[PDB]
Amino acid sequence: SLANTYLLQDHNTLTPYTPFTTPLNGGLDVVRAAHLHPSYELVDWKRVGDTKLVALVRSALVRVKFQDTTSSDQSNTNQNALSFDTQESQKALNGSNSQDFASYVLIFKAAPRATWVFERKIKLALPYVKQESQGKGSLYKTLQDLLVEQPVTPYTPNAGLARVNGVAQDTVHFGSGQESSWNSQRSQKGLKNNPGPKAVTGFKLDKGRAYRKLNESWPVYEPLDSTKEGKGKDESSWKNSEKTTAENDAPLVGATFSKYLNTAQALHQMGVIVPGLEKWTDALPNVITQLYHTSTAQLAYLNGQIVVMGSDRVPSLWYWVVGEDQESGKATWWAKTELNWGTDKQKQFVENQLGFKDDSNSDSKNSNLKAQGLTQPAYLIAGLDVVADHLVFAAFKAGAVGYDMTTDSSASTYNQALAWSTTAGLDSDGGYKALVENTAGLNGPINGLFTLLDTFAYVTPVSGMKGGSQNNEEVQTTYPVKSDQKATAKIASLINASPLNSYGDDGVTVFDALGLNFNFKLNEERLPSRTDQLLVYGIVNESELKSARENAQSTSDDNSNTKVKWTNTASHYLPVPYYYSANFPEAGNRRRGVKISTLESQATDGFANSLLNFGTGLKAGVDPAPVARGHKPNYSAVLLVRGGVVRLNFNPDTDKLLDSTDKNSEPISFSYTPFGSAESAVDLTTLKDVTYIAESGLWFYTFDNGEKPTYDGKQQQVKNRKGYAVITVSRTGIEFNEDANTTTLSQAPAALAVQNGIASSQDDLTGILPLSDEFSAVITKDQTWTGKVDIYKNTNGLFEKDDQLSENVKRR
């Protein structure tokens, strides 16, 4: 209809466009209309029905503090350790009312002449964590020792991710010089039939990319090679000397860049508060402040409830479930949200690598998440959407491992993180379930280089119940802590700003990230990792969401260790395409080794690395095609990852994940289809919009080149920050209840991503208007007052410019 309007964003303004391609009015300035400070920036917004508009706003002036010490042994005992630093926020203002500059969810009501009236704002309060005095699991204790990696920027090179390998597990349990007694004593050490004495226990934290505490700050600088430069977790060495070294080597615009990169503009673009680079040398604000600012990134509205989640480029430790009626709402911790990983074994894999837990240990400095009875703490959120009165989400599991707190300089695992490869053994039984439930690396390391005669492999040739001479015994695995040190061990928690648990500069980590581990069977099957490059997805109902709100609103008391249970979720191993790397290795050759530092990236999808996977643009959609009599209409959610499109399938009759009877069959709820060279050329970090067209059942992914950082790591102006590209996602394969007898599905219904024909490298995009099923308008800026309008003909998701109408709509 002509009376219909399309809402388009321009920074803080949402302008209504008519099907004549012209704006109806000056648009709604979300920040000005909500009576908010100029520092507020519109992050996300959703039109709800026809009379509602929900917006998400954040300010670069927000300051967060974590109270670590926990003085006396009484006090208020019910005060949150997490609070907004009003004094620092006022300090930052200096470069008229006192405010914390907290993020808000804004509610607007429709008004005549296609206008919006401000209704109310809901404050996104910090999650709750009780300040102790006690120095029953403690999240407070974990947060005191928690280390978070500096965010991975699009300019982070492969060698920058590479960390020197940790100590072998034979050295850990037998000590230097006594490693030779492995075969005879492994049995009495909880390592019966373990064939990997040389399996790496983790990665060195003395050098490389910064790991910082909640109240510490990440540097703007990052090393080119983490095996050679950087100070890792060593904040003192950075502050005292290495800061000035990086400052001289990598200065900001206004100087060889031989050791470090200045990624200031890349961080600002990721939603990291970089003072002096905001719209309206100084160290960046706290890790805790950066985590708050980045966590208020994406929203969804579901029957009076608003859900807010973090960004896809920085890990988030919490999420919001707030009432529309409420004035404010505290966040729910991800560590207190137990998800279904597919199998109980799959949960065990993630949770066992979180840290060390033993009945004999009760040391307060062994503060890791596992010891505190907490679950997976962080996620790299691909997005969230609502469909059939349910919330659908997808995220990559951020790497969360343990680290040794020891002061003993000569200790085996001193100054190192404890992480290992969890790839299923070469001898795993067939089928999806047998592979994911394979015991290889369940409790500790096992994988490494195994030289079978003159053919190598980076995975164990024996696992599960295929050990011993008779191949019937258990191949045991145990945590990398020496038996005598179990009672006195001090393992804390560490969060990686990527889907990787281990950064160990070795072949096994390369094989695990690139999905290069395959069994030596004619029916060749890819061996899955149960900790690296893990995509987490699911459907969540109102009662599951209500539990998350209730868990957030609980103040210390007796529900401090109570967990939220989302059972209709799953996890899937989703590595980066190996072909994104120029020199990808292959197991089974003739010796001819490729580690992280020697891996060469040939990726053109907006990342200097070819190691870490990334997920963006989750959008749900109800299939327009008719289904069989007595069955609900099908719905799926799609998202873009490095190398292809992933489709998530659900059962509409139960509002659960799409499942089948057979366990040998791959899950029909998950599908990954690799996209072509043309779509691999698209910068996935520049996604500006995702739209689903109900009538056609097609998703449209809009990419804006203006979303790129202004300067690269070597402080050079970024090439092609002009233009746009559009990808169309369509359904493929047999659908659920497609016909009368379609009961169970053998194959997972897939998606297909293609560059549709709407592309340019010379103009700034205002937006795209779906004028009809057959036509679409592409609004552009250059200096154009009315905005340059291009008309395209829609041929089932494929587009071709109409020169006749494009000129006609242009010419004055």
Residue numbers in the entry: 23 to 117, 128 to 167, 176 to 294, 373 to 398, 462 to 773, 779 to 998
From the publication, what sentences describe this entry?
M. pneumoniae binds to host target cells by means of a polar structure known as the attachment organelle, and glides in the direction of this differentiated structure at a speed of ~1 µm/s. P1, together with the P40/P90 polypeptides, forms a transmembrane complex called the “Nap”. In the present work, we report the structures of M. pneumoniae proteins P1 and P40/P90 and of complexes of P40/P90 bound to sialylated oligosaccharides. The structural results reveal that P1 (1627 residues) and P40/P90 (1218 residues) present a similar overall organization and topology in the extracellular regions.
After numerous attempts, high-resolution diffracting crystals were grown from a construct, referred henceforth as P40/P90N, spanning residues Ser23-Val1003 that, by sequence alignment, corresponds to the N-terminal domain of the M. genitalium orthologous protein P110. The refined P40/P90N structure, at 2.65 Å resolution, has agreement R and Rfree factors of 21.4 and 23.4, respectively. The sequence of P40/P90N presents two long insertions with respect to P110 of more than 60 residues each (Gly297–Thr368 and Leu395–Thr462 that are referred as S1 and S2, respectively). Both insertions, completely disordered in the crystal structures determined, are found between β-propeller blades II and III. Besides insertions S1 and S2, the structure of P40/P90 presents only three short disordered loops (residues Ser118–Gly127, Ser168–Gly175, and Ala774–Arg777) and the N-terminal domain from P40/P90 can be seen as a well-defined globular structure with two long floppy pendants. The primary scission occurs between Arg445 and Ala446, located toward the C-end of insertion S2. Structural stability of the cleaved protein probably relies on the large interface between the P40 and P90 polypeptides, with 75 hydrogen bonds, 6 salt bridges, and a buried surface area of 10,480 Å2, which gives an estimated free energy of −55 kcal with an expected 100% probability of formation according to the Complexation Significance Score algorithm in PISA32. Regardless of the extend of proteolysis, all P40/P90N samples behave as a single and sharp peak by SEC–MALS indicating that cleavage takes place only when folding is completed and that a unique three-dimensional structure of P40/P90N is maintained.
